[PDB]
Amino acid sequence: GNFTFDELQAKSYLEVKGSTLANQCPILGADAQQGLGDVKPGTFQLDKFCMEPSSFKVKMPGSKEFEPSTLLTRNTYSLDQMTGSVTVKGDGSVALKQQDGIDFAPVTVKIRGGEMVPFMFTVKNLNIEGKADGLTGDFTVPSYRGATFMDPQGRGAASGWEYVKGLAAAGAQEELAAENVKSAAATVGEAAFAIASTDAATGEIAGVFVTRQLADDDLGSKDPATIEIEGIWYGQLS
Amino acid sequence: RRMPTFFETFPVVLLDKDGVVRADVPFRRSESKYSIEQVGVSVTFYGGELDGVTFSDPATVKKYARRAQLGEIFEFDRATLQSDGVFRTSPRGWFTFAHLCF
Amino acid sequence: LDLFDDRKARQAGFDIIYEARDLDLPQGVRDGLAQARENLDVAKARIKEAEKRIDADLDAYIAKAYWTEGRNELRRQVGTLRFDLNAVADTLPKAAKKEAQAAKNEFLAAVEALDLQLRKKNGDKAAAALADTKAKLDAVIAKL
Amino acid sequence: AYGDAARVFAGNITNKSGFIPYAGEGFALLIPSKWNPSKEQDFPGVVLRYEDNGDAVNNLVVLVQKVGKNNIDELGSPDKFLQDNAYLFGESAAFTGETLSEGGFLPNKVAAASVLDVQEATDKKGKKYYKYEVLTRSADGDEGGRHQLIAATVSNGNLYLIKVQCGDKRWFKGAKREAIGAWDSFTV
Amino acid sequence: LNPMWRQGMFVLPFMTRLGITQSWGGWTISGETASNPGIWSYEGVAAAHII
Amino acid sequence: AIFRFILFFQGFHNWTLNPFHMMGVAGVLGAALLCAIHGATVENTLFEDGDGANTFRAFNPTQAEETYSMVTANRFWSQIFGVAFSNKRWLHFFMLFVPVTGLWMSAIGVVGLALNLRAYDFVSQEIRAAEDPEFETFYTKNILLNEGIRAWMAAQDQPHEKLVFPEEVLPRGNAL
Amino acid sequence: GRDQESTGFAWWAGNARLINLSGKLLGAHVAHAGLIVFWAGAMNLFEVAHFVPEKPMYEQGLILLPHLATLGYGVGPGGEVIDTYPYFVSGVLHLISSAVLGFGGVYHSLVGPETLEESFPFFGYVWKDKNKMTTILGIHLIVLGLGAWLLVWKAMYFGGIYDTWAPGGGDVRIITNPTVSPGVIFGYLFRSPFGGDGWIVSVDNMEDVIGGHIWIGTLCIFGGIWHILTKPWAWARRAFVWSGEAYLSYSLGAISIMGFTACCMAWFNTTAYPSEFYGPTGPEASQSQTFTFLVRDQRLGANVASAQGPTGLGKYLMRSPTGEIIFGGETMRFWDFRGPWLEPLRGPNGLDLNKLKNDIQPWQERRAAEYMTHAPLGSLNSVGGVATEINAVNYVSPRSWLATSHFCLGFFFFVGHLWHAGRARAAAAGFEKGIDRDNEPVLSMRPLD
Amino acid sequence: NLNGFNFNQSVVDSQGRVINTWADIINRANLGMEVMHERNAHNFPLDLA
Ligand SMILES: CCCCCCCCCCCCCCCCCC(=O)OC[C@H](CO[C@@H]1O[C@H](CO[C@H]2O[C@H](CO)[C@H](O)[C@H](O)[C@H]2O)[C@H](O)[C@H](O)[C@H]1O)OC(=O)CCCCCCCCCCCCCCCCC
Ligand code: CLA
Ligand code: CLA
Ligand SMILES: CCCCCCCCCCCCCCCC(=O)OC[C@H](COP(=O)(O)OC[C@@H](O)CO)OC(=O)CCCCCCCCCCCCCCC
Ligand SMILES: CC1=C(/C=C/C(C)=C/C=C/C(C)=C/C=C/C=C(C)/C=C/C=C(C)/C=C/C2=C(C)CCCC2(C)C)C(C)(C)CCC1
Ligand SMILES: CC1=C(/C=C/C(C)=C/C=C/C(C)=C/C=C/C=C(C)/C=C/C=C(C)/C=C/C2=C(C)CCCC2(C)C)C(C)(C)CCC1
């Protein structure tokens, strides 16, 4: 980060263009009270909610420990401009729900062995609740590829060949029955958010997040891996 | 509709006795008007190994309609010689090719 | 397929993109210049909305030092202001339209100065130019 | 031999309206002059079908179906009539699965139809008509949607229906004129 | 259970004996993850010999 | 009509992937290269047989001495390219030999293609792409292009087959 | 005239017979200038007589009229042609001046002095006299600087020039504060030619154009004065070939570079080449198509921000490789586009979701639709659309014509520069007519390995 | 984007019907190889790039 919302809005597009400052989340000023702060209990409208990751770890199927990864797709992995609702109770319990906005970004990383691991970074339909220092929840992870995506041999779920066009002699291809079927089914993930600062003067919040989800499976043709994503987040309450 | 000699791959369409299309295996399954699932086509075998056996599962019906393009459906042993699955040519073709070049 | 009721989309402006691409229609109809001249109510409403938006939003943006937002606002909805002013002033007698043209030219020079100051990021100069622009816009509106 | 001289130095074009009139069994319409006859019968009761030379997506079809009612209103409300005849836009029967990665589509749906306009009107003779205007979109985005124009009526105990299809890509490039002309000329 | 010597490697143990354990592919002869392999990896040494 | 013939040969036979056609195109392009390079080299190593800037008039067909410097041409092309001709007879025989061999190889390829003996596919690549839905090369893209060409040209190019194809069986990409 | 008997140059190379004839060369140059002015005037008259007001300028195949529109002549707010008389005036003036120039060239080429080195010493010259050539170069540099200043005066005092970025729509503005900052001027000149940077083609406001023209006028005048008062130094005498053909080759290379730059500017620029008079550019059409499809699908009740495409990247909005919010699809390569109708919806970090969800204007939508349908695609017989379309539309973009023609001209003049530089270097050395049989240079060198 | 000659639907009979030509067969082949050049890189109907 290292820039606030006002500082970001004080620039020009030609000054931000190319500097990778559009892939970052704003931080709060010195007026931000620590913890939950002085927020009046109630339900607020969430706006400008963004999450900037700071590390990716991959646990290959068959391993019990996460591993570091190297990003391959440059600065395209920040979710931003999401909108929703935030409710604060008198005790301190808070509930966060995400409705719209850019809440998904495909990401590809490489691991120690040299295997590229695509995954679908998203917090779509986020539903978390808990205290200020911890918010456990879940989200839905849509398929990496759509139903109309066609594989290199022209096989797709809702459009494409249902078999292998090249192997004409093999009438049924019972050996290839596994790869001829495509399913774009969705899955779910888990999240654990936290709140570190809050400014009731302008209705701004910030904290950290840790999420766990699954990598892609090439439309049901692979065993997905588990990926842990951690970083910071920011949002505005109004 | 039987697959002509020219085509390496041919679409699967089903015609009635008047030559009008009635069913096919669609490439774009978002909207379909002659889909086998819609029409409800079934296959029955007369004579041979599968005499008297009727298949109504759409996947099996599609699989058998795919092999009807090649002509008479047969049973092959693709394990003795590890056949890859692409058609070859006969001594007729080899002789003709070699002697034209010569 | 599955039916959806979207009959109210046309009342929301669904045919604007299809009419703008109709090569049979004249260019004035495609660009919307013919409709505004035929119906001056649209021009008057656009002028009033542009004036109100200029006042409130320019004050807010210059106060908080939002230069990009201020310039975009100056050319987002106000983008038809010159054409609307010309159309309104073309329906006036010779002397009245001459005075309106002079006032409009002065106002446009004021807006140009305000945009230059917003680009150069001078808060006090931009505020003074904005006050002058508001005065000139009020004068030209009263002239029409 | 024929003996007919060539039309040298002729300043008149035989046909320039872009439409060719057609006289059928109980109906008449103006078919676009650049469309060729087709041998496909996708819906029950097809008695006429024409498709464009350039793109086969643009086509029209006329259905004459047998019903008991002698009036179109007895088949239900225009909304109910359109709901009953929803097979005219096709069905996603071949796609059997669940998905959540479509652009602006309901879950497990790869196609949708937007009813842009409905209308009920009577001709000069005095026969009621049901006019529809739909835009069906696909998951992949074929041609940016398809425009369907439907005009249905009942005469002598039979239902007469016409559906004119035109891809959006051709629709906004100037081919909407032929489709609208064929749709508006349907007389029974 | 699948060490260097079970795969019939001849020159790789001789490279490893003198202190080369990392590769440009990200892996390490001990099963860990490579940290800045540098010029002197297995591939680097092979390329140096070719040059 | 010849353009349609060429496109048909691409769509149905994969004629671009035939080694005999590759030899033919290599021969044709090499013949053009040889023609241009020989013309330029002869014209830029001439001898000063006149006083006018128009050098076309300093020649006589019945003369004995050659009109250009073979030694200078050989040295130039030896220092520029690495190899050069030192025999005029060998030069001109090579000029004759290249396009004739290219065209003969192309003819043998077309003779082979007459019986649908086309080098159409690589079986290993097809099997790998079938087993692994992530493997893609330019060869598979060319295969898909050929399939599209065949499917969309078959109906009109061959009226005798009476192919009626519903719009939903023709292969097609997303939004295009 | 002359003949091959006393010159040695054939009829197909006959213009080389007047290399050392100053009067005839001057006559030929004056006649050619008259021809250029004649074409300008005649083409302007032809284009002004075939112009209808119901269609935009770029839809009628005009290339000279948009040049006068950008100077603020006969145009109004929004980019609508209002008056036509100034175009007629310009064409008539050009035609009559061409008549005068043609008479002068014919006189100087037919009956004028053949070699003006004895009767007119001021105008006489020798190709090998460096001082005289440098003096002539300085005089013409002063003239060009005066022309640049004349362009500058138009945008300041004589009504101004059309500004497509003016607040409240494009209109003929007056440039009061040109950018004369050395850092700004040097930034355009020494910029990379690749994407994003764009070299000098990326100039995005009229203030920079006017400031650069002030700079170039001052530089040209100062350089002309410098060359009139000086002569080439030793390091310059040691590096160049001093002959008429050599000077011609230098000029040919310079103008080939100029032609390539003009082609690129016509294809890519939007400030000096407003889309109101030239039509949309390449990227502009794709951005407009994505914008209008987003608007239409949003009107049908869809979530554009969260919509996912077949590949899983985003149907309408995706993220640029540096982080900016851009359009989705194949138009992800054109995210460097910046146009007057799209900038108001763009925030500091790219496109603004709320702005394009609640504050999209009908004029913006109309501009997007018009630039989508009039894409710069066509055929040689002027058939609009992609190569797999039908014969329905007779349209080819004015940007395509200028770009293609000027690329062809630039390449051919580069080839001409190569030819003439080689010939000049050979002829000055003295072996342009062939090798000497008596003394062949190669025979005196040691054989290679 | 200054393509070659486009003689598509050029020959038209007296009543307006289109008479095909070798150019139209070439157009059919082009349409075949156009919709399959990039199967998933397009979201909108026009390939303006
Ligand atoms: C000093 C010596 C040179 C030093 C540097 C040499 C580097 C060499 C690197 C190796 C590769 C070769 C060169 C590649 C050039 C690629 C040019 C390019 O991608 O683009 C060219 C650029 C265009 O830049 C574009 O500029 C655009 C301008 O932006 C803005 O433009 C307007 C501004 O108002 C609009 O607002 C618009 O919306 C907005 O985008 C965008 O930025 C684009 O992204 C950007 O690509 O043009 C320009 O730089 C202007 C013209 C440049 C020269 C001519 C190019 C064409 C001819 C090639 C050579 C000759 C070939 C024929 C002879 C062959 C035999 C010898
Ligand atoms: C761009 C135009 C152009 C121009 C301006 C010139 C100019 C010139 N040429 Mg070149 N030339 C050109 C193209 C051009 N040429 C081309 C394309 C070729 C290849 C065919 C040649 C080949 C060539 C040769 C072979 C020779 C020249 C020579 C000459 C020069 C002598 C003139 C003369 O003796 O002719 C006398 C000709 C005539 C009496 C005919 C008169 C017709 C007039 C000039 C027509 C213009 C009139 C116009 C319709 C009305 C204008 C009047 C006004 C009031 C409007 C002259 C400076 C000569 C030279 O080298 O001089 C030393 C010569 O030997 N030229
Ligand atoms: C019309 C075009 C023009 C032409 C053809 C010439 C031609 C010539 N110039 Mg002149 N000159 C011009 C305009 C022109 N000049 C202008 C406008 C100025 C004012 C700056 C000068 C000032 C000038 C000086 C000070 C000198 C010459 C010299 C020379 C000769 C050397 C050739 C050369 O450039 O070396 C080949 C080129 C190079 C080695 C590299 C040059 C490219 C520069 C460094 C690029 C960067 C530009 C520079 C930093 C300027 C600032 C940028 C701008 C934004 C302010 C040659 C006769 C020399 C001489 O003989 O004088 C008698 C010399 O010393 N010229
Ligand atoms: C810094 C240099 C930059 C350019 C470097 C160019 C390097 C290429 C030089 C190739 C020379 C080979 C000549 C063999 C044969 C040889 O020794 O040539 C030498 C031969 C000798 O001619 P003579 O007149 O002496 O022959 C007398 C007669 O009696 C022969 O029977 O001259 C030629 O035929 C010239 C034609 C060269 C034709 C080149 C063919 C193209 C190369 C193929 C590239 C394949 C690449 C595969 C990569 C996987
Ligand atoms: C020397 C020479 C040459 C050349 C020449 C030349 C290049 C010339 C030019 C010339 C020129 C360049 C001329 C011009 C002229 C012009 C004129 C004579 C004009 C006139 C005009 C008028 C008469 C107008 C009228 C009008 C008006 C006023 C208004 C509107 C209408 C009108 C248009 C009617 C040659 C090649 C043969 C070769 C040999 C030598
Ligand atoms: C107006 C304007 C502007 C401005 C501009 C300017 C100011 C420019 C300048 C320019 C310049 C200032 C240029 C320059 C150039 C140069 C060159 C291009 C050079 C070249 C050289 C050469 C080629 C050389 C060679 C050689 C060598 C190397 C060696 C020895 C020999 C010789 C000498 C030959 C701007 C953009 C702002 C904006 C728009 C408008």
Ligand code: OEX
């Ligand atoms: O990348 Mn290679 O190909 Ca020239 O078009 Mn648009 O982009 Mn894609 O599609 Mn078609």
Ligand SMILES: [Cl-]
């Ligand atoms: Cl796209």
